[PDB]
Write a protein that binds this ligand. Structure first.
Ligand code: VZK
Ligand code: VZK
Ligand code: VZK
Length: 581
């Protein structure tokens, strides 16, 4: 086992090999053209084939990141295009590789793909392998933290849609509904992975480890604790390597894990038979999306192991993370109706109970009643969903977006405008994704997605920190972000923004831009409105909104759009400044 490059090549095969290397280069250099990365992939691939033939050949024993870093440093346009990135190549390993990772851009400013089915189906028949790569390069360059083995899965189902749609009479009718159903899933998968990496890089291995204990024991209530711990150890390693750019080691270990569980179905879960007959990529995705198993019939009451035992303090101190891991497992298995975001909050609260109770001279009097305290955590969110689902159904998606945009801009005005827009749009979609579900399931849906969206706000905010209120809730804890943001109030410590005419001038292009761009442009001007008038009441904001709708509709219809915006524009500013100031 003397050549890491050869060990990886043999295990995944050339096609997967080229795929993940193109991913790694796409996430490292997101602005570099597609063709330049293919040569890098092709060059490194031939060298790998040389090492499989001869392992004693020069350079075959070097670490993966070295070879990757070596080829990255030869890019003639490294400095002039990525700036300070070009000083990474002055470092040794592993400080050099860490210098690259720190430059992954979560807001790459990349154009928005407008796929046209005619030219797109033409590119597929031209070369089925090249089109496969183009999707890889385009998805990975806008999401540099994507779970790489899943991107290949999405890439195969991509060509699969084309395989069946480019042969129909109405291509457009076949392609566009399938790809949009996919586009939502890949963004949801990118946000999930971005939160997993955020856990380790900002809260430690124990944070991602405890997340796996939650979901696994939830999905696999039959597997005993020793079995769950085994899967957790290897799964956390899989995510640890993927989040660290160790894509080749990540995929290989995901394949090794998917192989282990299928050969151990009887001791894990009974709903994996169908999941364990698909090919490699399909199988692993099936495993992650598998239905949960049935709760055992005669489970001992939770109070037994963690409340009345006169040795809870003893068993805790000897193996804290193991004793706590046992608690999450026992609680996650018996309660699959809880959201993951909820269960770790119960374990984190139980942890805080043990540290302080065992300090007291009579810990037994202190921790025996912890479950009464814990039971009260589940009901605290319960009324937030209702107030949000009622507002939701009343105003609708688009109106609900502007509702939170108004509410949350008043809470954290210092945040930059493109962030408040993007985040407030995603939060409103949680209504369409959760408030139509059954009532007793509306709360698990919300908290799950909220933790994926609030992590985006933090991820976008830690790059350019401008708000202390946001930094506090993002770094205090990983589980209590949703209550920490919901508990924020509009503070009178924020000075309103000075008036900017350019942020309220409109042109005839508003009648041309795509629908998403029309709404984003309108919501961007809305955010700037509150940054200037943070205390404008809801009745006045209602007035301005209708005045702006009538403004846009009027001028998108006249014979001369330019002269209409010319005249009516200033009029709107006057009436708005009068009504609000
Ligand atoms: C796609 N491809 C070329 C291949 C070919 C062969 C592969 C073998 C293994 C494990 C092989 C083994 C190793 C050790 N024992 C005791 C049994 C089996 C894993 C992935 C593979 C991938
Ligand atoms: C465009 N498209 C639908 C298709 C169809 C079939 C494809 C097969 C491969 C081979 C993958 C492999 C090759 C060699 N070993 C040892 C294992 C796996 C790669 C991409 C494909 C793309
Ligand atoms: C406090 N409570 C038990 C609840 C809960 C949910 C409720 C929903 C509605 C529907 C409101 C609507 C009606 C029609 N459109 C088109 C949208 C929304 C009315 C009262 C409610 C009262």
């Amino acid at each position: 086992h003397k050549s890491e490059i050869a060990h990886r090549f043999k295990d995944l095969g050339e096609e997967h090999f080229k795929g993940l290397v193109l991913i790694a280069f796409s996430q490292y250099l997101q602005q570099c053209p597609f063709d330049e990365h293919v040569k890098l992939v092709n060059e490194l691939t031939e060298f790998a084939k040389t090492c499989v033939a001869d392992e004693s050949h020069a350079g075959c024993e070097k670490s993966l990141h070295t070879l990757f870093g070596d080829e990255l440093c030869k890019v003639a346009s490294l400095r002039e295009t990525y700036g300070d990135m070009a000083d990474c190549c002055e470092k040794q390993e592993p400080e050099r590789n860490e210098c690259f990772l720190s430059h992954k851009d979560d807001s790459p400013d990349l154009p928005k793909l407008k796929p046209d089915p005619n030219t797109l189906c033409d590119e597929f028949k031209a070369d089925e392998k090249k089109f496969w790569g183009k999707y890889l390069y385009e998805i990975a360059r806008r999401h540099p933290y994507f779970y790489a083995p899943e991107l290949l899965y999405y890439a195969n189902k991509y060509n699969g849609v084309f395989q069946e749609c480019c042969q129909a009479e109405d291509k457009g009718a076949c392609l566009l509904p399938k790809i949009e159903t996919m586009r939502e899933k890949v963004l949801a998968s990118s946000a999930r992975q971005r939160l997993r990496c955020a856990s380790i890089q900002k809260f430690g291995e124990r944070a991602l480890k405890a997340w796996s204990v939650a979901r696994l024991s939830q999905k696999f209530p039959k597997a005993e604790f020793v079995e769950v711990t085994k899967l957790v150890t290897d799964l956390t390693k899989v995510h640890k390597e993927c989040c660290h750019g160790d894509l080749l080691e990540c995929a290989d270990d995901r394949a090794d894990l998917a192989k282990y569980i299928c050969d151990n179905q009887d001791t894990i879960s009974s709903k994996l038979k169908e999941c364990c007959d698909k090919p490699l990529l399909e199988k692993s995705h099936c495993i992650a999306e598998v239905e949960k198993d049935a709760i055992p019939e005669n489970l001992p009451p939770l109070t037994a192991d963690f409340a009345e035992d006169k040795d809870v303090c003893k068993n805790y101190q000897e193996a804290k993370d193991a004793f706590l891991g046992s608690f999450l497992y026992e609680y996650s298995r018996r309660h699959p109706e809880y959201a993951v975001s909820v269960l770790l909050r119960l374990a984190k609260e139980y942890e805080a109970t043990l540290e302080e109770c065992c300090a007291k001279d009579d810990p037994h009097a202190c921790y025996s009643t912890v479950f009464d305290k814990l039971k009260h955590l589940v009901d605290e969110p319960q009324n937030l969903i209702k107030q949000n689902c009622d507002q939701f159904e009343k105003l609708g998606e688009y109106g609900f977006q502007n509702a939170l945009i108004v509410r949350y801009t008043r809470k954290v005005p210092q945040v930059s405008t493109p962030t408040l827009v993007e985040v407030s749009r995603s939060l409103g979609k949680v209504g369409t994704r959760c408030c139509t579900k059954p009532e007793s399931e509306r709360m698990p849906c919300t908290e799950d997605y909220l933790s994926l969206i609030l992590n985006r706000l933090c991820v976008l905010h830690e790059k350019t920190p401008v708000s202390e209120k946001v930094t506090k809730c993002c770094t205090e804890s990983l589980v209590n972000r949703r209550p920490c943001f919901s508990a924020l109030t509009p503070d009178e410590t924020y000075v309103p923004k000075a008036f900017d005419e350019k942020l309220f001038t409109f042109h005839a292009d508003i009648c041309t831009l795509p629908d998403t761009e029309k709404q984003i442009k309108k919501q961007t001007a809305l955010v700037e409105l509150l940054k200037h008038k943070p205390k404008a009441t809801e009745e006045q904001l209602k007035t301005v909104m209708e005045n702006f709708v009538a403004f846009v509709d009027k001028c998108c219809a006249a014979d001369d759009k330019e002269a209409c915006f010319a005249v009516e524009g200033p009029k709107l500013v006057v009436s708005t400044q009068t009504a609000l100031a």
